[PDB]
Amino acid sequence: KLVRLPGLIDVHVHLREPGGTHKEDFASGTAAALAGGITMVCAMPNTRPPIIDGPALALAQKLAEAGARCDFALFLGASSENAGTLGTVAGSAAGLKLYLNETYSELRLDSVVQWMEHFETWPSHLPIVAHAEQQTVAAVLMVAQLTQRSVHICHVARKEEILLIKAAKARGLPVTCEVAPHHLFLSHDDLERLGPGKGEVRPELGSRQDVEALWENMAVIDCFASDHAPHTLEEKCGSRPPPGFPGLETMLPLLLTAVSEGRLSLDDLLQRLHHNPRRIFHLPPQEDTYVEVDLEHEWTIPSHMPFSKAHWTPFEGQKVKGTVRRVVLRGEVAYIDGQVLVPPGYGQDVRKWPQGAVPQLP
Amino acid sequence: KLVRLPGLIDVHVHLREPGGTHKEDFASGTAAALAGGITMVCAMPNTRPPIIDGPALALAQKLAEAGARCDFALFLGASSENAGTLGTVAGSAAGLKLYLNETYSELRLDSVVQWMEHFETWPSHLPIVAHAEQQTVAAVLMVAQLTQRSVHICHVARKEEILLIKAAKARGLPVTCEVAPHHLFLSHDDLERLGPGKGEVRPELGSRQDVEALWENMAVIDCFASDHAPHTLEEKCGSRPPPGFPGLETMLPLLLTAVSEGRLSLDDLLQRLHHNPRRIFHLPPQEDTYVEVDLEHEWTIPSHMPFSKAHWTPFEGQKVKGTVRRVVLRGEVAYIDGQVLVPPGYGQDVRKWPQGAVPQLP
Ligand SMILES: NC(=O)N[C@@H](CC(=O)O)C(=O)O
Numbered sequence: 001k002l003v004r005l006p007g008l009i010d011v012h013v014h015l016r017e018p019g020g021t022h023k024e025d026f027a028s029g030t031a032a033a034l035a036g037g038i039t040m041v042c043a044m045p046n047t048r049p050p051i052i053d054g055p056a057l058a059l060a061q062k063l064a065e066a067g068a069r070c071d072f073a074l075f076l077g078a079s080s081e082n083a084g085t086l087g088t089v090a091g092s093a094a095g096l097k098l099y100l101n102e103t104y105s106e107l108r109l110d111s112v113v114q115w116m117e118h119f120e121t122w123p124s125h126l127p128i129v130a131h132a133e134q135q136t137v138a139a140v141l142m143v144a145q146l147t148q149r150s151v152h153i154c155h156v157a158r159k160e161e162i163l164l165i166k167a168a169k170a171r172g173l174p175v176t177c178e179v180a181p182h183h184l185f186l187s188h189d190d191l192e193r194l195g196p197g198k199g200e201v202r203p204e205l206g207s208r209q210d211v212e213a214l215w216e217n218m219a220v221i222d223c224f225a226s227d228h229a230p231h232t233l234e235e236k237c238g239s240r241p242p243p244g245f246p247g248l249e250t251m252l253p254l255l256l257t258a259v260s261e262g263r264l265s266l267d268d269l270l271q272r273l274h275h276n277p278r279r280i281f282h283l284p285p286q287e288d289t290y291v292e293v294d295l296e297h298e299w300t301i302p303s304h305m306p307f308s309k310a311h312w313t314p315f316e317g318q319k320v321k322g323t324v325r326r327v328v329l330r331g332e333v334a335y336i337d338g339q340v341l342v343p344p345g346y347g348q349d350v351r352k353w354p355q356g357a358v359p360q361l362p
Numbered sequence: 363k364l365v366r367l368p369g370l371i372d373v374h375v376h377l378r379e380p381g382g383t384h385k386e387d388f389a390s391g392t393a394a395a396l397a398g399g400i401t402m403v404c405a406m407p408n409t410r411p412p413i414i415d416g417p418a419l420a421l422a423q424k425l426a427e428a429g430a431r432c433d434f435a436l437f438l439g440a441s442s443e444n445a446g447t448l449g450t451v452a453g454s455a456a457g458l459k460l461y462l463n464e465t466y467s468e469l470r471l472d473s474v475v476q477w478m479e480h481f482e483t484w485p486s487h488l489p490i491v492a493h494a495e496q497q498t499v500a501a502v503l504m505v506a507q508l509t510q511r512s513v514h515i516c517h518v519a520r521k522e523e524i525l526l527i528k529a530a531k532a533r534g535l536p537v538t539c540e541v542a543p544h545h546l547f548l549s550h551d552d553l554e555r556l557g558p559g560k561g562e563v564r565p566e567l568g569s570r571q572d573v574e575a576l577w578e579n580m581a582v583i584d585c586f587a588s589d590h591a592p593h594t595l596e597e598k599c600g601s602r603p604p605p606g607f608p609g610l611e612t613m614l615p616l617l618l619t620a621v622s623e624g625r626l627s628l629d630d631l632l633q634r635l636h637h638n639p640r641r642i643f644h645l646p647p648q649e650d651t652y653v654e655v656d657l658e659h660e661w662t663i664p665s666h667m668p669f670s671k672a673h674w675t676p677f678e679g680q681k682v683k684g685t686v687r688r689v690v691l692r693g694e695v696a697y698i699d700g701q702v703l704v705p706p707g708y709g710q711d712v713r714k715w716p717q718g719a720v721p722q723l724p
Pocket residue numbers: 014046103104105131200201202203227229230242243244245
């Protein structure tokens with residue numbers, strides 16, 4: 001007896017194309033998405049070259065249209081030089097991404113004034129998401145208030161951060177946030193097993209108290225999103241390990257396990273992987289699209305999942321209950337039982353659909 | 363220059379069929395919906411007979427399928443005799459409605475134990491909405507906590523009620539709510555003009571301080587919904603005036619005026635008339651469906667709007683800026699400039715669509 005879910009949306013993925021295609025490309029990352037029950041992804045701009053201007057966006061759009069197997073939207077990235085220059089293309093992007101801390105990106109902004117300039121110049125009706133850890137969450141919230149608009153906080157990982165967001169929501173401030181599965185299902189207790197290289201991620205793995213605070217404050221979490229951040233094992237185990245975990249293929253099985261254990265409800269899951277992504281990012285429905293999952297099948301996560309070119313996973317050895325059996329995307333069987341059955345290029349840029357434009361006043 | 367909006371959803375309408383068709387029927391009420399930019403309605407169960415058992419629901423479904431011009435879902439109503447009897451049909455309804463105070467209904471429950479019985483027996487994955495005023499909001503929230511599930515509060519009208527809900531959300535409790543336009547745009551200051559008969563509504567019109575508290579606490583309001591409650595002028599002006607206002611044709615123009623004045627944003631409006639209705643009630647997308655509005659046209663609300671059989675409106679004389687120009691429903695022109703162009707029966711029960719079933723564990 002399978003359960004039919006709507007097409008799930010991951011608003012935070014790194015697909016590495018252009019420029020890092022040994023780690024992942026549109027075709028492989030979207031195969032991983034489909035195998036994870038995800039039918040729409042929003043791809044981050046920290047590629048090589050980074051998606052920080054109109055020519056880079058145009059290239060990325062064509063690479064995605066040719067390689068993606070599920071539907072997508074592409075973020076633009078904020079830089080120290082592009083505020084005020086993105087107005088013509090802004091509405092074609094998922095939103096604008098700000099990198100406000102050290103992480104796998106060359107896009108760090110060096111002054112809060114640059115953050116203000118982006119909040120003032122990016123069109124006010126379009127999404128802004130921020131990588132903002134610890135006190136940076138409070139700082140970017142201040143910039144959002146000064147500029148009288150909303151912000152979405154990426155990968156919240158700490159008790160400190162979720163409680164700050166909780167306090168902001170209690171004051172009626174327009175802030176939303178997402179949490180990634182590694183910050184719900186891994187902690188410092190796992191760094192022994194992972195090692196210091198594999199274990200590198202931003203935000204770093206939290207304490208048990210951080211993990212427990214995120215679960216305790218589930219009501220504050222608007223979205224789940226994988227922060228699928230594929231790097232090869234050679235890179236993760238080498239001398240200068242880049243931060244990030246692959247996660248598209250493991251996210252849904254991990255969360256379904258938690259549903260089966262009563263840690264959150266099926267509805268809680270679908271708000272966070274479907275409805276809230278849609279409404280925060282103004283992402284359109286996908287016609288004739290659904291995911292069938294089997295909630296009874298118990299399995300152990302292996303040393304690598306089948307599709308991501310990362311070819312490793314930090315969840316190796318965890319027991320899960322829940323598997324994706326079939327994905328139908330826009331009337332076509334896209335995935336069955338370990339086989340992806342739509343080719344590279346089946347996926348489409350949802351921002352080009354009539355229903356995928358963000359509504360705005362004339 | 364028109365603005366394209368998605369198909370808007372009104373989760374609280376009274377269409378009066380069966381049994382009150384001189385006040386409204388499916389055909390006339392859904393024409394009013396379309397003219398108001400609404401493409402999907404959830405119809406309340408306080409009809410004659412009331413929709414409190416499977417035979418009454420079956421009749422109402424067929425009357426709606428034959429008369430509705432926009433899409434719909436039908437609520438079931440809680441009674442003092444039907445707890446534990448609705449399990450077979452529950453998933454075919456919009457949700458379950460509880461009438462917990464005096465209003466236009468014979469469905470009042472006389473004991474909190476009856477509320478508990480409904481919360482315990484209605485399927486836990488399906489929506490429950492409550493007419494719950496003043497302290498009754500706190501009481502039904504207690505019942506929801508005792509039974510470990512969510513509740514949605516209909517037509518919140520008072521500072522007391524919105525602050526209670528705000529406090530509950532700050533504690534992470536699963537409660538959502540809606541507000542009707544008369545509680546945002548009318549107050550005691552209007553009872554002089556309306557008179558005691560026309561002015562009768564439940565919840566009653568609030569003070570200026572109530573209205574200001576609702577605006578100040580917009581962040582707490584999940585949905586707008588009209589509580590379209592048509593009664594004829596003869597009834598409203600007679601000896602025993604029933605409570606309620608018609609509102610489908612005026613809701614969107616009133617709210618667009620507020621958007622134009624900067625009282626809330628277009629996004630704030632679309633969260634409350636599209637995304638949040640979808641996610642709270644698990645209502646499916648409507649393919650090829652959109653509303654085109656003109657935000658520049660200034661007009662004065664007349665003594666009655668064209669479509670509702672109520673043939674009166676409490677907003678007469680208010681100046682608005684914003685009009686519905688065209689509605690496309692599932693690929694067909696449904697409304698243009700004062701003319702409805704889909705016949706009775708074009709509308710469909712969204713709970714019968716594959717994408718319209720509420721997901722549940724096996
Ligand atoms: N989270 C990570 O550790 N890495 C992400 C970047 C990011 O989301 O900050 C990546 O692109 O590799």
